[PDB]
């Protein structure tokens, strides 16, 4: 969350809680309400943004679905889909979590070294998740939309 | 469910009145009814398993070509024997119902209301009804107002088969 | 929409047989006293317009708010439409214990009018007092003896203040 | 008595309140009228669409049918508008479809088999359901069928329909409102008490998380074939 | 509402374009096998009857429960209504397979029938297995060549399952 | 009366509009189907006499207590007979002005519209009318896509029957 | 969507009953028809561009107004001459949409509905399109059938406009 | 269904007293300026098939995908009905601006069509942007002079704006 | 097993293994390869097993379909043969094992709370085993049904 890099920053001076610190902790609670309602709206659009941004990445990108890539088949796209779920539901953790470091334990910590290992396009995910962002746009009021789109380019230059 | 209570009911509310003195000469004659009707309902349970083998009896014994024929809709097999006494028991069932309703409500909603179009596409002749209903009429053993009444609601239902 | 009479042949035809004999004999000593039941109903009948004048005038002077401006029986058709809700929630409880059941005042009132008083801003809590007023004026009214044969009028007492406190508490 | 005048409520945007420049097509309902003077046998398909709008479908037993109505309509004594008040306050309608709502399912039911229309909002409901309780539900039917709104689209003659259901350019309409609004709702259901869910399908633990239908995506696989050229050849590019 | 005409026109009409050649010959054997649709239809409709009373005969032998009281088709009106609810769903079949596209049956039926049965309390599995039912011997009815030329009606035995399982699956 | 061109009209009154190809259409069917439809009614006018007496006597094979049991709705005397195998011309001679009129209209409007309240007033099976016009429907003796439609006729009626 | 089958369904549906010989009619009709209309579709097709020009200069030809004054509906500049012939091929597209669907739903649906009220807002003359269409109808090259049904196609289109 | 003397009517009853000095001398100077009101919503009511006309040329001019087939206005039906929908949008802001209120364009408009365009797939973007040309076009219709008496309509066209931003943002 | 059961019997003396108890442990291994073969044939049609079985049931015990007992709709029936697909596992891994100690440090040792606390009776899971037992010995051989049912009547005496 918020508080835990400023717990852990805080923590290994062995220093107090020092109020240029508290000050975005009392801003973040205010701002947790609506944080929340950004959180319901995803997920209550979850179904719809699955089939969408998967769509929207198989014509910029088809080769990927093309015969000698990795997601050729109805099988393997169907486990290329879900892949695409966890980074839906990750991104909407950290959102209602403040901060990134949800992100950070599991989405891209060891990212660049399974999708190596899995074989799989690396780059080609990064473009998945840069057409989530576009259609989360959509649903959501722009103001709120401008909080949670800085949550979806964290992802983009961390896969790329 | 047309019983005179809760026509009653009906008629006052949808002539948006409260209740008259209308309503309590229907009361009053609905427990006369009652108080008659009630041990003559308890009197057919008593007497029920005998009157509708002895109706399944009857019907083979008037139309014995429903036991020869093969046919899924005849009682031929004794699968049809045990589903033809069980519409049997449903018919004395629903008199006794309508005995203790004090109405033609019971059997107008659970036997006459779809009863044509049933034996319209099972190849079921009402006829067979008609003369089991004849049979139970004929072989109650009631006796006065009661009698007479309970042959009303089986001719009733004799008027609505044919 | 049932009787007693039709409750129990429901009851019988769900149970898939005949009517048992002790519910028979239940059924007699309804018929017994359903006279009992009614003489009851129809003094009750006869008083209604003073039982909910009486009612609506006990709970303006208790709660006075509601005829100030702005409140919500204040305006003189919404107060006509207020003493006709009234009217009407008193016609089905006489015609429960008519007919004995109260399935007829389930199924003409309560279902509906709970949500409609939420969403026109009725207040519930002024009905909900104004109906067990009414209703204890009712059973008020219903016992007192001016005339009439002496009867056992008591559990009909019991039934008359069920269904009003079943009204009371689905209006709410 | 001071006749109480109908509750106001607040209008919807529907279909029906907008002119359609519209061709005829397969969509759009058969009006069945009396004024072309029918044949004997359109006759029965007149009063067979009116029982289907009013009843619903299952509802069309010969124990519920009205043989005096249809003799007074095929002899002219009656319109199709007094039908259509006939078969809605008619013994089997009120008992089936009257007697297992609430007076606010009953209006919804009325307004969408009368008036061809959905109900604008909760308050159109709410506004009917005080007329019932007043006038009964013969004075509410007649007041419905003395509607402007009536009187405007079916006039005397014509059997009401569902107004619109189907926009020109769409393949999938509205629901049909005897889909929509069956006899009985949730709470008279669960008055009547029973339902047996009694077979299975088995299977041995087999699903937590996949969403297996790519479906629409795909597919293109047009593909293609690949030749070869010298590198060398500039073929890769020199900038200045 | 639509056709397989139709379904093309609007595909074409959507991309912009005129009908590309291989859908007009595709339409073109369509239009050769749509009498070979049409034998299995006619030959469907005429023991429509004999199918829905063989369906619901198969069914409330399978499953007793529906006719034993208490149960969602025990009384005579409602079994009526079970037996006009699985005609209805056998007829929009037929004009399904008339037209040659689901949409129809889509229409018609599905969308809705669903939500009314729950509403209802009607069990969806036993009308699906009984749809199931009826399909399986519409198909063993329409596949039996007697008195009539030879030919083939495989593709149109997979489009009518597909029709019938289309039907079962949006009841569920 | 449900003919194709009849229909049609309806339709294009009932929309309000002029004839359009779709009508044109509907009639070079209907012309196509009338140039073999005329001959198999006169075909099935010339054994008609044969086919009635055949399906009567099916009838009585099949059904043989119907010519036992004393009865005014069974055919037992002679009157019956007579009746009887009226209506059984009756039922073919509606199966020869659908061939004609190119629709199930005139079986619809002569028979079917009241044959069940027809049937249960007077204790006529309809399953004998079914077995009759299964007899018709075997015994017709045409061939190809006339004795097709020919069977949905008669078919046509079975259905409605039961 | 006026096209036979879609109606006939539509009829079979509105009366409550399965189909009948009167729709299998209409349906040896619908396909004699489109064994003919389909090639001709293929035909309009090939045929396509050059009519769309030539039904352009001749509009041109007819009103050479619309080609002198400055105006906005008028196709004096570039954009209108690319929006008019846009609409040009839009009417062809249309009559060939209509000759595969076998009626005259399709031109229903995507022109006359609002095409009134569209030149009415847009002080677009129908009579542009009259010529247009006429001289698609002499300009198409086909012949038999197929063509007299085109020119019915053509008619429908220029009946309904004006 | 509210007009400026019927919100203050109704504002005071809430209140449950008489009206006070201030909103009548606020009310006199509607009086003096409601002729001032509703000359220039005759001048805007005066061009506005003009207005509507070169707002959707301006709107399919700037967005050519709702032209192009598969767009939301392209199929002629559609776009009649396109037409229609915005004349009606505008018909409503006359009224509102007659009577001096929104709760008319709320009332009639506001509270059904943005769930009407969520239902239809109509985009409801670019009938916000059509609805903020046309309103920007009609107070630029109204503004100028060409043979009135000048006069100083600094809180009418703020009151024209309010309402064409009040259409444009319940649309959305 | 039988060598689980041989070694823990053999610390309670803390002796070696007795010779004649070594018998019991060479007359499970060359009795294995036909008890193996039950165990695959009982595999071979767990569906078909339990989609017969647990019909005759539900005709002998009325109350778990007619409503107001405890298991229903799909909601609970389906995890009702859930838990009688735990059973039959159970049993095929007891064939394999040869003995009952599978099944009893698995599946009954804490049967009769966990369905006492849990609403429903215990005699009618009794009756499904039963239901069980008949249809295993029809797929079965002769002397095959009496080594498989020697396991089945042991989930009888447990719970009931
Ligand atoms: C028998 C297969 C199953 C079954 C049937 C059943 N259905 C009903 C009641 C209704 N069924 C419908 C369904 C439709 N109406 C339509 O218009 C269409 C498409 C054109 C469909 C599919 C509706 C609306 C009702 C309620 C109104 C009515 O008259 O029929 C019942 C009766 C329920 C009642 O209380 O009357 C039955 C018995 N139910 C079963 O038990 C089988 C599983
Ligand atoms: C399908 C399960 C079986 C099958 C059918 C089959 N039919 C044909 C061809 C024709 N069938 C008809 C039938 C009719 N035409 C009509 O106008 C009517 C009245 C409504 C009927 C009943 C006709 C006339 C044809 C073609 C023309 C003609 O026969 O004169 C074929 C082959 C030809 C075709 O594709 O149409 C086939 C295969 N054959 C089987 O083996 C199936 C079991
Ligand atoms: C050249 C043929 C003549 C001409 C044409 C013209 N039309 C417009 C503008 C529109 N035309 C349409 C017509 C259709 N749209 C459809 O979707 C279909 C069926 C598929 C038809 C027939 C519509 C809707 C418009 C308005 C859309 C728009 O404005 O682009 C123009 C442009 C003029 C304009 O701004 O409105 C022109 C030039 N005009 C001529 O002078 C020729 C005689
Ligand atoms: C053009 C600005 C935008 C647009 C318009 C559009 N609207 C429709 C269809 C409907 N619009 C309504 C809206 C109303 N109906 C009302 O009664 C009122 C208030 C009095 C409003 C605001 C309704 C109900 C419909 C559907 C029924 C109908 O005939 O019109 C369409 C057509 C959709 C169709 O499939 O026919 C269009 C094109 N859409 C756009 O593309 C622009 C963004
Ligand atoms: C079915 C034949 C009988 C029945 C079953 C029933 N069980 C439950 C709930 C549970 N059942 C289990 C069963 C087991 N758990 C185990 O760990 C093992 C050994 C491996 C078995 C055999 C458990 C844990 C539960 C709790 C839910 C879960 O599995 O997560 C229900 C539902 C009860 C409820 O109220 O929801 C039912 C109906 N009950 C009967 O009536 C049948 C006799
Ligand atoms: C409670 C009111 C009620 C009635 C009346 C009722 C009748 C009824 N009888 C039926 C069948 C039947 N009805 C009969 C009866 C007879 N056939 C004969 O040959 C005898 C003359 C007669 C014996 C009385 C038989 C044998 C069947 C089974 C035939 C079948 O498959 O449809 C069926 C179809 C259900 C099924 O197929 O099992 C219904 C609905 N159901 C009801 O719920
Ligand atoms: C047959 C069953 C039935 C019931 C129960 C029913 C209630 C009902 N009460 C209503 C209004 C009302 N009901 C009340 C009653 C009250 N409000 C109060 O302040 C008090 C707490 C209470 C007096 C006891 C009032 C004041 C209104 C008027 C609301 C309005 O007109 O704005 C309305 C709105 C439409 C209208 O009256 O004219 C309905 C539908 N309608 C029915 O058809
Ligand atoms: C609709 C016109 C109408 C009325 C009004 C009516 C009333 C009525 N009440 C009766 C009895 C009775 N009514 C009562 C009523 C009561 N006794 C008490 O002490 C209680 C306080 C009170 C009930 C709250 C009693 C106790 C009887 C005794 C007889 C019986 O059980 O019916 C009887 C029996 C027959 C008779 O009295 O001649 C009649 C007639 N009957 C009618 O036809
Ligand atoms: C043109 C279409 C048409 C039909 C179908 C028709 C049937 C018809 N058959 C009738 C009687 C009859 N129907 C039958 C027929 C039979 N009974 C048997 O036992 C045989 C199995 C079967 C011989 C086919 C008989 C014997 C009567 C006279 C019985 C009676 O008094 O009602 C009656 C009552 C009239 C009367 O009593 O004479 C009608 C209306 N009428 C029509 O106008
Ligand atoms: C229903 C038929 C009708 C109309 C149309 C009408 C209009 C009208 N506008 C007037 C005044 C006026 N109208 C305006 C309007 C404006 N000036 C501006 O510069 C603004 C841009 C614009 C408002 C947006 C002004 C400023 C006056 C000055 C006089 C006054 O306050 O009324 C007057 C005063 C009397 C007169 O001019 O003879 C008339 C008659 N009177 C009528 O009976």
Chains 1, 9 share one sequence.
Not at chain 1, 20 to 26: A, F, S
Not at chain 3, 88 to 97: F, G, N
Not at chain 4, 61 to 77: A, V
Not at chain 4, 225 to 238: D, E, F, G, I, L
């Amino acid at each position: 969350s918020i508080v835990t890099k400023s717990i852990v920053n805080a923590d290994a001076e062995a220093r107090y809680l020092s109020p240029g610190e508290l000050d975005r902790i009392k801003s973040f609670v205010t701002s947790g309400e609506r944080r929340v309602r950004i959180a319901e709206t995803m997920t209550g659009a979850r179904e719809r943004i699955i089939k969408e941004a998967g769509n929207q990445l198989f014509q910029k990108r088809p080769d990927v679905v093309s015969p000698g890539g990795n997601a050729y088949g109805e099988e393997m796209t169907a486990t290329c889909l879900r892949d695409l779920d966890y980074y839906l539901r990750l991104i909407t953790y950290g959102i209602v979590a403040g901060d990134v470091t949800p992100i950070e334990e599991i989405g891209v910590v060891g990212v660049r070294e399974m999708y190596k290992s899995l074989g799989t396009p690396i780059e080609a995910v990064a473009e998945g998740v840069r057409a989530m962002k576009s259609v989360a746009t959509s649903l959501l009021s722009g103001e709120d939309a401008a909080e949670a789109g800085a949550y979806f380019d964290y992802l983009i230059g961390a896969m790329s | 469910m047309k019983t005179p209570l809760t026509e009653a009911v009906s008629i006052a509310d949808s002539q948006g009145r409260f209740l008259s003195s209308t309503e309590i000469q229907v009361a009053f004659g609905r427990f006369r009814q009652a108080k008659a009707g009630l041990e003559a309902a308890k009197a057919l349970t008593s007497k029920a398993d005998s009157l509708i083998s002895g109706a399944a009896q009857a019907v083979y014994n008037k139309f014995p070509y429903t036991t020869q024929m093969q046919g899924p809709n005849y009682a031929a097999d004794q699968r049809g024997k045990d589903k033809c006494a069980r519409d049997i028991g449903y018919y004395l069932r629903m008199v006794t119902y309508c005995l203790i309703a004090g109405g033609t409500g019971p059997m107008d909603e659970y036997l006459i209301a779809g009863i044509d179009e049933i034996n319209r596409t099972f190849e079921l002749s009402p006829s067979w009804y008609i003369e089991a209903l004849k049979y139970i009429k004929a072989n109650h053993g009631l006796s006065g107002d009661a009698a007479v009444e309970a042959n009303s609601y089986l001719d009733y239902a004799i008027n609505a088969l044919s | 929409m049932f009787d007693a009479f039709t409750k129990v042949v429901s009851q019988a035809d769900t149970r898939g047989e005949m009517l048992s004999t002790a519910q028979i004999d239940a059924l007699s000593q309804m018929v017994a006293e359903s006279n009992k039941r009614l003489d009851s109903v129809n003094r009750i009948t006869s008083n209604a317009s003073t039982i909910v004048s009486n009612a609506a005038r006990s709970l303006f002077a208790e709660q006075p708010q509601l005829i100030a401006p702005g409140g919500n029986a204040y305006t003189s058709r919404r107060m006509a439409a207020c003493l006709r809700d009234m009217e009407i929630i008193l016609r089905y409880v006489t015609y429960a214990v008519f007919a004995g059941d109260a399935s007829v005042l389930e199924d003409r009132c309560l279902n509906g009018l709970r949500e409609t008083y939420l969403a026109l801003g009725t207040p519930g809590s002024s009905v909900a007092v104004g109906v067990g007023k009414m209703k204890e004026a009712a059973l008020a009214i219903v016992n007192d003896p001016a005339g009439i044969t002496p009867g056992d009028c008591s559990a009909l007492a019991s039934e008359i203040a069920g269904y009003f406190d079943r009204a009371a508490a689905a209006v709410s | 008595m001071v006749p109480l005048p109908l509750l106001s409520y607040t209008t919807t945007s529907f279909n029906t309140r907008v002119a359609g420049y519209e061709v005829p097509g397969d969509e759009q309902p058969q009006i069945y009228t009396a004024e072309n003077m029918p044949s004997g046998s359109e006759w029965d398909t007149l009063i067979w669409a009116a029982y289907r709008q009013i009843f619903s479908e299952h509802q069309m037993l010969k124990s519920n049918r009205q043989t005096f109505l249809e003799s007074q309509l095929k002899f002219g004594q009656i319109t199709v508008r007094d039908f259509i008040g006939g078969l809605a306050t008619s013994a089997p309608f009120l008992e089936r479809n009257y007697q297992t709502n609430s007076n606010y399912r009953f209006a919804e039911m009325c307004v969408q088999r009368i008036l061809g229309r959905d109900v604008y909002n909760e308050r159109e409901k709410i506004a009917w359901s005080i007329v019932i309780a007043n006038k009964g539900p013969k004075g509410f039917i007649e007041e419905l069928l003395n509607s402007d709104e009536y009187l405007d689209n079916f006039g005397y003659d014509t059997v009401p329909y569902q107004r619109r259901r189907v926009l020109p350019q769409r393949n999938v309409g509205e629901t049909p409102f005897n889909l929509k609004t069956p006899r009985y709702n949730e709470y008279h259901r669960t008055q009547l008490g029973f339902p047996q869910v009694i077979w299975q399908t088995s299977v041995r633990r087999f699903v937590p998380q996949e969403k297996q239908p790519k479906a629409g995506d795909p597919a293109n696989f047009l593909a293609m074939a690949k030749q070869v050229s010298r590198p060398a050849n500039t073929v890769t590019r020199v900038a200045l």
